[PDB]
Write a protein that binds this ligand. Structure first.
Ligand SMILES: CCCCCCCCCCCCCCCCCC(=O)OC[C@H](COP(=O)([O-])OCC(O)COP(=O)([O-])OC[C@@H](COC(=O)CCCCCCCCCCCCCCCCC)OC(=O)CCCCCCCCCCCCCCCCC)OC(=O)CCCCCCCCCCCCCCCCC
Ligand SMILES: CCCCCCCCCCCCCCCCCC(=O)OC[C@H](COP(=O)(O)OCCN)OC(=O)CCCCCCCCCCCCCCCCC
Ligand SMILES: CCCCCCCCCCCCCCCCCC(=O)OC[C@H](COP(=O)(O)OCCN)OC(=O)CCCCCCCCCCCCCCCCC
Ligand SMILES: NC(=O)C1=CN([C@@H]2O[C@H](COP(=O)(O)OP(=O)(O)OC[C@H]3O[C@@H](n4cnc5c(N)ncnc54)[C@H](OP(=O)(O)O)[C@@H]3O)[C@@H](O)[C@H]2O)C=CC1
Ligand SMILES: CCCCCCCCCCCC(=O)OC[C@H](COP(=O)(O)OCC[N+](C)(C)C)OC(=O)CCCCCCCCCCC
Ligand SMILES: CCCCCCCCCCCC(=O)OC[C@H](COP(=O)(O)OCC[N+](C)(C)C)OC(=O)CCCCCCCCCCC
Ligand SMILES: CCCCCCCCCCCC(=O)OC[C@H](COP(=O)(O)OCC[N+](C)(C)C)OC(=O)CCCCCCCCCCC
Ligand SMILES: CCCCCCCCCCCC(=O)OC[C@H](COP(=O)(O)OCC[N+](C)(C)C)OC(=O)CCCCCCCCCCC
Ligand SMILES: CCCCCCCCCCCC(=O)OC[C@H](COP(=O)(O)OCC[N+](C)(C)C)OC(=O)CCCCCCCCCCC
Ligand SMILES: CCCCCCCCCCCC(=O)OC[C@H](COP(=O)(O)OCC[N+](C)(C)C)OC(=O)CCCCCCCCCCC
Ligand SMILES: CCCCCCCCCCCC(=O)OC[C@H](COP(=O)(O)OCC[N+](C)(C)C)OC(=O)CCCCCCCCCCC
Ligand SMILES: CCCCCCCCCCCC(=O)OC[C@H](COP(=O)(O)OCC[N+](C)(C)C)OC(=O)CCCCCCCCCCC
Ligand SMILES: CCCCCCCCCCCC(=O)OC[C@H](COP(=O)(O)OCC[N+](C)(C)C)OC(=O)CCCCCCCCCCC
Ligand code: SF4
Lengths: 95, 50, 368, 48, 353, 175, 55, 71, 69, 115
């Protein structure tokens, strides 16, 4: 019940879709695509993308991770390791 | 010093119970007595001389 | 509104008076103008009184309901908003309202007739008496608000009396009378939106088929502010309407999705959100309530108007002549139907409908 | 005389200490009255 | 006419009796609000209402009529269910409880051997009316009152029910009129003085009256469950709460002070000897006397309801929970064993006659 | 469509009673006006020192309850709003919300110099210069603070105004 | 073990609400006393020559 | 034991409760006779919850811990 | 001061018409010695009854019957 | 005494590099609570417009160089963040915050009075 159902390909696929809703330089986004160089994101543009990625996967990047993340692949790895389903009420599970 | 103005609402409440008791005790008793006189309305209503 | 409504600090009225404005245009500022707003306690009247009094213009508000006039005084500073107890059947009361006024705005009009007044008396008789009294008082400017489908040859009592009202006002006051033809106005507690927001709308198949060009009420009051203080608008006719045409059925269904009445599939039909009735029955019910109900209900004339769509007089002027861009209903629809949302209450997430969201919702409504 | 002053002898003393004397019978008497009322009440109940 | 009218009245006579009965209760409840303000005023050295009707006799009418001419506040007009379901259930519960209150011998609308059970059962329904107002409500003060209301019910319900059962056990009957007649020789205040105090305390808790006014504490929960109520819903809840005060005051007079039985038997005979029993005037006076005896005893406890309000501060509801379970319940359960032991010892087990 | 409006029909406040229905609706108004005047329920809205004088109206010396005056803690159960104290900018939104939560009919009383025009704090950066900038005021009570009799006189003036209401006769003659 | 009053004496006051009935009796005493209310506007409160009112 | 009289009283009590609501609905003046602020269903500033003046978080359906649940 | 005997004494001294007017505005039946009248027409009295409290020894009788100012 | 929710201890940062991280950390907190701001205050705009507004206000102080000014600016931003998240502001204030709105020529100001 309360377990992750994510896959590396699905997380990467949805990560690309979110990042293509911004004014990024290139629409060709993969694991090795860097935010600063390939996507041309500054301080505030990068944080806008990170929060937007937080909304998609319902995860919250910590301060250390968000201040040191460089590539999209690191975002994908963080989502896979830390994502959990939100706890439901008592009625949703046992009924 | 007895304040009579404070006792006015209690007197009206006292009359409130008496209104229910006076009507219920008399109207119900009269209805039972009237219907025990006979099987027809000419005996229940009209009272004979004898 | 802005910060200073007048285009200049010195204005010369049509009657020759020179009026000087003082202050930057706040509550303590003055414009030198005194205006009378007939029917200032109505829906549009409160908007007009608020805009005039907020910049210092003296407002004289004739009234018949004593409790309804109280909230008008908050708009202006001390001595700005004045009240006169009046009746359209009392000539002296009307003459006192316009004695000191440079501008007279006639917002008096009705769609129903009652035991004391007919449709002719209010739409024609009241307008004529106000217009003639204004001229004898030497009022520089008169502004009359007719309806959107004003036509003296119309088969509807409301549209015909409004059409005659335009002509009788110009004859009495003179060629210097400006006439405004506003479309149905949407706003907080707007009569145009109140009917759509009513859950138990009897005969929605016959009534909600009318197509209109709804216009923002705040802009109509803003337009009147432009017209009153601009002598270049004298003698003209203004049709105030939105760009996008809407049918009441489209608005009714679009609102239904915003209110989230459809969260339960059975509820809209069970609650009576659809009340299909034959028109002959609606005519009978409207005829009966015209003499039984003490409150103005859906009457016979409004039943006729459901078959008449809003037609725009091309010769008349628009917001472009006044230098304004009409507001779009899609932008302001959510904020005026928000109070009627069922639960909301920030439970999980408020569904805020933007300009693009409303337009998409219109496509969903018409999608079978 | 030409001002507001207290009398020559001064004002009489006032009461400002706590004055809440106890009242009523001893608690044992009230307990006996409760038992006496209960005893007599059950006696009349028993007779009825 | 005449003949067709003299039997039409007979056909509708018993509806007039009920309407008169309803008016009799309403008058007492209406003027209890005036009496409470007058009684507290003089105790607080004020006057109380004296400027609404001659000496304040129209104060109740003005308060009711003004509220009946007030706007009803609700999210939508169709939401008339939500703010009216609560008060209506509370009002119906207390009005139906008056059916088994005999103003005289056999002068009750409902006569049954289970009148005691009907009385307690009907009163418990009124609690459900109070909790209805807090129906997933958005008002935080309404919600807090519902939690307190349930807590108070757990306090008094066990204590109040068991005290009434002891009186019923002493008479071996659950009929209210039989309980009244059983007190001809002794009023149950004397043998069961502790129970009368306990009953009155439970009555205060049941009606949410001070010192147990935690449901409607103005200094704690502004107005409690009535903070969102206005116009008719407020009146119905206000009417129901004061109808319970009269009902509980009348119940105290019935269970412990002989109900309608005369204060003095000699005085009762002398007054009735002035009237002929062959005329209806005797039974009009008799109903006035018997209900007058009940009214005097009931007015004293309605005075006592006001008296305790003007003399005691409010007690916290969590302290009330410990008060009933640790003190009241052991005492009442002790008496429910003590009483049969006394009766069996002296061969005085009760029977119904 | 011919309209013939009479010219010399007196306004409602001057219009005498002519037919039978005039006395009927005037009786309807007076029964309601008497009830609301007698059941004068203000709301407990004490802000500053003006509230202390408002408490002394409920004191035994004046005993506002003798006139039918009861203070209610909820806006739903109150029809009179007495602004007794200073209205600050931080407080103004709260005052407007509480006023809007009172069901109609409702009246507002402005007591003291603070509520009337700001009084001692008129030239303050955080004080509203008169509660009438936020809510409509029916009667202004002067004083700093107005005495307990000054407030009672203002209430009497409002009750005099309430007894002159013609809500139901207005529907018959003016609508 | 150092209480001055016996357990029965302390229980009699506690069970029979000794101080509560004392408080009730004091409140009833005021019920038979003259109130303080004056009938404004037919009667007026005290005033002094130093009083400040309308200018 | 006859209970026809009791049944009539219960019928009257149910009807009596509706009279209080019906009287209040037919006695109050219409909004247009008052300040004419419209229907209560639109006056959201009035139909909203009471929070002593300041709006707070909406916790209508939040859990409420009860310290006397065992009692 | 709140005794019924005081009301009966004032009822007898004033009479029916005077007391009924007090029963309409004054909410109290009071009697006193006339002190004088003002230009508006109001009458002013002083009470010699020993049972009257401190602040209630002077009162006015307004001209109007239904409203007082 | 326990501090209120979302309360930070005031501190004077003596490193410019550290100050940049704190601003970035606070910048993300504003973006994450944008939907909460819309829900709590019942705004008429979507959360996307709120985030645009937050970015615009942050960009107004992007080129501030003096470190002592940064500490005051950061401290006041933390106080503003705490005020919004805890629903201490009334809904009217937030509505007016987003209700913020080619200048007039010389003659246009001249004809009306100017300043
Ligand atoms: C009955 C016996 C009283 C009596 O006959 O005379 C007093 C009483 C009038 O009091 P009063 O003679 O003016 O008082 C003497 C001086 O005026 C004023 O003398 P005083 O006020 O200085 O007297 C003081 C006296 C209190 O004054 C009394 O003596 C009254 C007795 C009060 C206690 C019993 C109740 O003592 C007290 O203050 C303590 C009493 C309270 C202690 C706690 C209660 C103990 C019981 O006479 C009446 O019985 C008539 C009034 C009764 C009400 C009639 C109208 C009711 C309304 C009907 C609907 C319309
Ligand atoms: C116990 C102390 C003795 C009680 C007095 C006994 C008594 O008086 O009985 C009389 C009464 C009549 O019955 P009878 O058969 O005539 O007895 C012979 C009388 N010559 O016999 C009876 O009817 C009994 C009446 C009840 C007896 C008293 C009950 C006291 C209740 C216990 C007190 C509880 C409080 C602690
Ligand atoms: C409505 C129906 C009626 C309901 C009310 C019924 C009323 C009757 C109540 C009956 C029970 C009352 C019991 C009173 C006697 C026992 C209490 C007692 O005597 O004290 C307890 C005693 C301890 O001694 P102590 O109190 O501490 O004395 C020294 C203090 N300075 O302990 C002892 O030494 C002896 C132990 C107790 C033996 C008797 C029990
Ligand atoms: N969607 C819309 O509302 C549209 C408006 N109009 C017209 O614009 C004008 C403004 O009306 P609006 O504010 O929108 O809504 P309303 O119909 O509620 O306004 C009517 C105004 O005229 C007054 N009035 C009506 N009859 C009388 C009368 N016998 N004596 C005195 N006053 C009277 C009313 O005063 P009181 O309130 O005191 O009774 C009220 O102030 C009206 O003339 C209307 O016909 C036309 C097309 C669209
Ligand atoms: C006996 C008696 O007093 O009965 C006369 C009655 C009521 O008198 P009351 O004092 O209002 O009864 C209230 C009783 N109390 C004072 C104990 C509350 O008077 C009438 O109106 C008839
Ligand atoms: C109970 C009877 C109610 C009838 C009301 C009525 O008939 O009211 C309706 C008429 C019309 O007047 P209105 O209500 O202002 O019209 C506005 C509302 N319409 C346009 C929907 C009708 O009024 C009368 O003829 C008043 C007669 C009063 C009789 C005494 C009461
Ligand atoms: C606590 C005091 C209770 C009380 O005063 O009531 C007890 C007694 C009377 O009732 P009783 O003697 O118990 O029985 C009823 C006795 N008859 C037949 C005389 C009514 O009242 C008084 O005589 C006052
Ligand atoms: C039982 C209910 C009783 C109602 C009491 C209030 C009546 C009221 O307020 O009556 C007020 C009314 C009318 O107004 P007026 O005061 O006469 O003014 C009118 C001035 N004329 C008389 C010079 C024209 O009077 C009545 O003729 C009421 C008749 C009622 C039948
Ligand atoms: C049936 C529902 C429940 C009962 C509700 C009863 C509510 C109480 C009544 C309100 C009182 C009120 O308002 O009377 C106050 C008013 C005064 O009015 P004012 O504004 O002060 O002066 C204005 C009036 N002038 C101009 C005349 C001064 O007195 C009256 O005019 C009373 C005179 C009318 C005739 C009275 C006798 C006729 C018989 C009446 C009884 C059948
Ligand atoms: C008869 C039925 C009605 C009354 C029932 C209740 C009476 C009190 C029961 C406990 C008494 C107790 O415990 O008594 C003890 C206490 C206190 O005395 P202490 O501290 O020991 O004094 C110290 C030792 N001395 C005695 C040597 C000085 O006395 C009281 O406070 C008595 C209260 C009297 C005023 C209230 C009486 C009227 C009540 C109101 C009308 C119903
Ligand atoms: C066998 C004879 C049975 C007697 C039957 C009657 C028993 C009554 C209750 C006694 C115990 C008690 O009142 O207890 C007090 C309790 C709990 O107090 P506690 O937390 O234990 O602290 C006290 C113990 N100390 C000192 C050891 C720490 O709270 C209260 O203050 C409850 C107040 C209720 C007041 C209601 C009065 C209403 C008016 C009544 C008069 C008409
Ligand atoms: C018992 C108390 C008696 C005194 C108060 C009576 C008030 C009811 C009369 C009334 O409301 O009369 C005024 C009315 C209509 O006018 P309105 O104010 O818009 O009605 C609002 C009331 N609704 C909701 C019933 C429409 O006239 C009539 O045709 C009444 C039919
Ligand atoms: C019945 C006994 C109570 C009558 C009191 C009374 O009639 O009260 C007098 C009334 C109300 O006016 P008020 O200002 O409250 O009078 C109180 C005077 N005070 C303030 C000094 C205390 O005035 C009138 O007569 C005007 C209306 C005509 C009579 C209507 C009577 C009410 C109808 C319901 C009852 C029949
Ligand atoms: S007006 Fe004077 S007394 Fe009243 S609140 Fe202001 S400072 Fe205090």
């Amino acid at each position: 019940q309360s377990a992750s159902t994510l896959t590396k390909e699905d997380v990467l696929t949805r990560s690309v879709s979110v990042l293509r809703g911004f004014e990024v330089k290139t629409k060709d986004i993969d694991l090795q695509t860097t935010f600063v160089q390939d996507l041309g994101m500054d301080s505030l543009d990068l944080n806008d993308a990170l929060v937007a990625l937080e909304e998609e996967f319902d995860v919250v990047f910590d301060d250390k991770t968000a201040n040191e993340i460089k590539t999209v692949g690191e975002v994908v790895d963080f989502v896979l390791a830390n994502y959990l389903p939100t706890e439901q009420s008592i009625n949703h599970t046992i009924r | 010093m007895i304040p009579f103005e404070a006792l006015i609402p209690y007197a009206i409440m006292f009359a409130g119970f008496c209104l229910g008791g006076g009507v219920m005790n008399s109207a119900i008793t009269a209805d039972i007595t009237k219907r025990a006189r006979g099987p027809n309305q000419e005996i229940k209503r009209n009272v004979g001389e004898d | 509104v802005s910060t200073f409504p007048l285009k200049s600090d010195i204005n010369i009225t049509k009657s020759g008076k020179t009026l000087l404005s003082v202050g930057q245009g706040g509550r303590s500022s003055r414009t030198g103008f005194t205006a009378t707003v007939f029917g200032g306690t109505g829906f549009l009247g409160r908007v007009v009184v608020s805009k005039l009094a907020k910049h210092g213009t003296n407002v004289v508000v004739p009234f018949r309901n004593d409790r309804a006039r109280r909230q008008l005084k908050v708009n202006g500073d001390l001595g700005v908003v004045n009240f006169v107890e009046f009746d359209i059947r009392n000539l002296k009361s009307i003459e006192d309202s316009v004695k000191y006024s440079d501008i007279v705005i006639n917002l008096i009009g009705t769609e129903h007739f009652s035991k004391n007044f007919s449709i002719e008396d209010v739409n024609i008789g009241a307008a004529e008496r106000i217009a003639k009294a204004a001229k004898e008082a030497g009022v520089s400017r008169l502004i009359h608000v007719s309806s959107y489908n004003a036509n003296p040859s119309s088969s509807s009592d409301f549209y015909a009396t409004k059409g005659i009202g335009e002509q009788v006002v110009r004859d009495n006051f003179g060629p210097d009378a400006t006439i405004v033809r506003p479309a149905p106005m949407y706003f907080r507690n707007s009569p145009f939106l109140n009917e759509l927001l009513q859950i138990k709308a009897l005969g929605g198949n016959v009534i909600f088929k009318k197509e209109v060009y709804p216009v923002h009420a705040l802009q109509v009051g803003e337009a009147i502010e432009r017209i009153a203080f601009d002598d270049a608008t004298a003698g003209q006719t203004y049709e105030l309407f939105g760009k996008e045409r809407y049918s009441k059925k489209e608005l009714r269904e679009m609102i239904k999705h915003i209110i989230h009445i459809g969260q339960r599939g059975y509820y809209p039909y069970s609650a009576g959100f659809y009340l299909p009735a034959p028109e002959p029955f609606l005519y009978a019910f409207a005829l009966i309530r015209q003499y039984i109900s003490s409150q103005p209900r859906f009457n016979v004339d409004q039943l006729k108007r459901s078959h008449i769509n809003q037609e725009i007089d091309q010769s008349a002027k628009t917001f472009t002549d006044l230098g304004m861009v009409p507001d779009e209903l899609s932008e302001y629809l959510y904020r005026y139907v928000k109070p009627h949302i069922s639960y909301t209450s920030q439970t999980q997430n408020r569904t805020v409908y933007s300009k693009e969201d409303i337009e998409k919702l219109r496509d969903y409504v018409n999608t079978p | 005389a030409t001002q507001d002053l207290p009398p020559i002898s001064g004002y009489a003393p006032i009461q400002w200490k706590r004055n809440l004397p106890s009242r009523g019978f001893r608690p044992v008497i009230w307990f006996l009255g409760l038992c006496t009322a209960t005893g007599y009440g059950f006696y009349q109940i028993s007779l009825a | 006419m005449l003949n067709n009218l003299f039997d039409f009245i007979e056909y509708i006579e018993y509806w007039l009796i009920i309407v008169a009965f309803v008016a009799s209760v309403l008058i007492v409840v209406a003027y209890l609000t005036v009496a409470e303000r007058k009684t507290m005023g003089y105790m607080q050295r004020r006057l109380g209402p004296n400027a609404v009707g001659y000496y304040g006799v129209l104060m109740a009418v003005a308060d009711a009529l003004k509220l009946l001419s007030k706007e009803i506040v609700l999210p939508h007009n169709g939401d008339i269910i939500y703010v009216m379901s609560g008060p209506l259930i509370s009002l119906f519960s207390v009005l139906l409880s008056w059916a088994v209150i005999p103003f005289g011998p056999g002068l009750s609308l409902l006569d049954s051997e289970y009148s005691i059970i009907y009385l307690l059962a009907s009163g418990s329904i009124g609690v459900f009316g109070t909790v209805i107002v807090g129906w997933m409500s958005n008002s935080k003060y309404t919600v807090l009152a519902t939690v307190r209301t349930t807590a108070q019910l757990i306090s008094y319900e066990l204590v109040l029910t068991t005290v009434v059962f002891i009186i019923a056990l002493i008479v071996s009957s659950l009929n209210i009129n039989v309980i009244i007649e059983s007190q001809y020789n002794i009023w149950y205040i004397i043998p069961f003085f502790p129970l009368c105090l306990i009953f009155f305390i439970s009555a205060l808790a049941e009606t949410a009256r001070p010192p147990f006014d935690n449901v409607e504490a103005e200094s704690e929960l502004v107005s409690g469950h009535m903070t969102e109520l206005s116009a008719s819903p407020f009146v119905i809840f206000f009417l129901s709460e004061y109808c319970s005060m009269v009902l509980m005051s009348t119940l105290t007079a019935i269970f412990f002070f002989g109900g309608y039985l005369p204060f003095s038997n000699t005085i009762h005979h002398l007054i009735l000897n002035l009237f002929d029993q062959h005329s209806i005037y005797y039974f009009i006076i008799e109903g006035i006397l018997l209900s007058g005896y009940l009214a005097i005893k009931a007015n004293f406890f309605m005075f006592s309801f006001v008296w305790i309000r003007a003399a005691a501060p409010r007690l916290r509801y969590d302290l009330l929970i410990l008060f009933c379970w640790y003190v009241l319940l052991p005492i009442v359960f002790a008496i429910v064993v003590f009483a049969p032991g006394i009766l069996y010892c002296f061969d005085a087990l009760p029977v119904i006659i | 469509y011919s309209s013939d409006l009479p010219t010399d029909i007196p306004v409602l406040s001057k219009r005498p009673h002519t037919n039978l229905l005039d006395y009927t609706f005037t009786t309807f108004d007076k029964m309601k006006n008497w009830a609301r005047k007698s059941s004068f329920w203000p709301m407990t809205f004490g802000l500053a020192c003006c509230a202390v004088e408002m408490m002394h109206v409920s004191a035994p010396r004046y005993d506002q309850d003798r006139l039918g005056i009861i203070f209610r803690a909820s806006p739903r159960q109150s029809d009179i709003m007495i602004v007794a104290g200073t209205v600050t900018n931080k407080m103004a939104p709260a005052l407007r919300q509480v006023y809007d939560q009172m069901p109609y009919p409702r009246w507002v009383i402005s007591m003291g110099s603070c509520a009337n025009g700001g009084g001692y704090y008129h030239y303050s950066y955080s004080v509203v210069r008169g509660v009438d900038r936020i809510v409509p005021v029916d009667i202004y009570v002067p004083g700093c603070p107005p005495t307990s009799e000054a407030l009672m006189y203002g209430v009497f003036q409002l009750q005099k105004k309430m007894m002159d209401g013609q809500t139901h006769r207005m529907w018959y003659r003016s609508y | 073990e150092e209480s001055s009053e016996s357990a029965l004496s302390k229980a009699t006051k506690w069970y029979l609400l000794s101080e509560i009935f004392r408080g009730l009796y004091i409140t009833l005493e005021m019920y038979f006393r003259a109130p303080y209310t004056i009938y404004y506007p037919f009667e007026k409160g005290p005033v002094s020559p130093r009083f400040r009112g309308e200018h | 034991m006859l209970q026809d009289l009791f049944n009539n009283y219960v019928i009257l009590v149910g009807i009596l409760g509706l009279i209080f609501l019906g009287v209040n609905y037919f006695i109050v003046e219409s909004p247009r006779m008052d300040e004419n602020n419209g229907n209560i269903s639109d006056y959201i500033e009035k139909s909203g919850p009471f929070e002593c003046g300041f709006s707070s978080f909406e916790q209508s359906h939040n859990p409420i811990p009860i310290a006397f649940i065992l009692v | 001061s709140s005794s019924i005997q005081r009301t009966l004494r004032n009822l007898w001294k004033n009479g029916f018409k005077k007391s009924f007017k007090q029963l309409q505005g004054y909410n109290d039946i009071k009697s006193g010695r006339l002190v004088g009248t003002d230009s508006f027409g109001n009458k002013f009295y002083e009470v010699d009854d020993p049972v009257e409290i401190h602040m209630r020894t002077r009162f006015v009788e307004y001209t109007g019957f239904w409203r007082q100012d | 005494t326990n501090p209120t929710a979302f309360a930070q201890t005031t501190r004077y940062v003596k490193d410019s590099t550290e100050m940049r991280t704190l601003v970035l950390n606070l910048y993300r907190r504003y973006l994450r609570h944008s939907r909460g701001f819309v829900n709590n205050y019942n705004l008429d705009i979507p959360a996307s417009q709120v985030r645009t507004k937050i970015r615009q206000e942050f960009e107004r102080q992007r080129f501030v160089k003096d470190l002592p000014l940064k500490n005051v600016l950061y401290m006041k931003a933390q106080m503003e963040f705490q005020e919004l998240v805890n629903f201490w502001k009334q809904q009217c204030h937030v509505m007016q915050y987003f209700e913020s709105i080619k200048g007039d020529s010389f003659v246009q100001k001249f004809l009306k009075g100017a300043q």
